Write a protein that binds this ligand. Structure first.
Ligand SMILES: [Fe+3]
Ligand SMILES: [Fe+3]
Ligand SMILES: [Mg+2]
Length: 247
């Protein structure tokens, strides 16, 4: 399995503190059946800046350690890009990373709102042949209060990625119920860990897949898992017709 959003790189954001932590997360991920992680450290204009070059280097150094430790996990470069107006431009100038240098870009909204220009930015990105993937939309306060915001973005071509832990219920029963609403409505195209540690923000990968199979049947979790395989090798993903979200 391919995990497309994860905070396993050390000394970069709220994720792994040092290499020991990174190794413990990798072991956790192996136990969940994950074999490849696209590292996506937080990248923002003030609080956390994590430059493409530094990400690539931390990922390569972590891989060397994992080969050393005989851990069968491979780490690839990416970023969790906090949305800003100039994403298309900076991407062209290689000042941002897409997920494994593919067409898919992981873009995060601020926690409490969806900036109005998102639709326009995402249209511009698509014209350049990029596909924006919305990070953890179930954790966005405004999408929570007004889930139609997500229906429209996805209909206009955006993909989104749900957090395994949200479906596993580790963030409350409320966040779980909302997450399932989003999946039913076909607004979700990937499941990923967003793992930060092995304590409170662990992977919950198998737990999430099991919840999906019980709620929807065996084909839907299989499709989501396969979307990650397609993303990694820069191929088109499977989409289902989006719909409005039930209360
Ligand atoms: Fe985030
Ligand atoms: Fe994240
Ligand atoms: Mg974080």
């Amino acid at each position: 399995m391919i995990d497309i959003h994860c905070h396993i790189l050390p000394a970069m954001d709220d994720g792994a503190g040092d290499s020991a932590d990174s190794i413990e997360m990798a072991r956790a991920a192996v136990r969940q059946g994950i074999r490849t992680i696209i590292a996506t450290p937080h990248h923002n204009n003030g609080v956390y800046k994590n430059e493409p070059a530094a990400v690539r280097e931390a990922a390569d150094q972590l891989n060397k350690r994992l080969i050393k430790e005989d851990i069968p996990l491979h780490v690839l470069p990416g970023q969790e890009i906090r949305i800003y107006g100039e994403v298309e431009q900076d991407l062209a100038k290689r000042q941002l990373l897409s997920l494994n240098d593919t067409k898919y870009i992981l873009i995060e909204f601020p926690f409490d709102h969806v900036p109005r220009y998102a639709e326009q930015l995402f249209y511009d990105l698509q014209l350049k042949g990029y596909i924006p993937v919305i990070a953890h939309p179930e954790r966005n306060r405004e999408i929570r209060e007004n889930p139609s915001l997500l229906y429209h973005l996805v209909e206009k071509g955006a993909a989104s990625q749900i957090t395994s832990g949200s479906l596993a219920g580790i963030f409350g029963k409320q966040l779980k119920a909302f997450s399932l609403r989003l999946v039913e409505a076909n607004l979700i195209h990937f499941v990923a860990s967003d793992a930060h540690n092995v304590k409170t923000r662990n992977f919950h990968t198998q737990e999430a897949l099991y919840v999906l199979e019980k709620e929807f049947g065996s084909e839907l979790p299989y499709m989501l898992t396969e979307n990650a395989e397609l993303l990694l090798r820069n191929q088109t993903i499977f989409r289902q017709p989006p719909q409005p979200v039930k209360r």
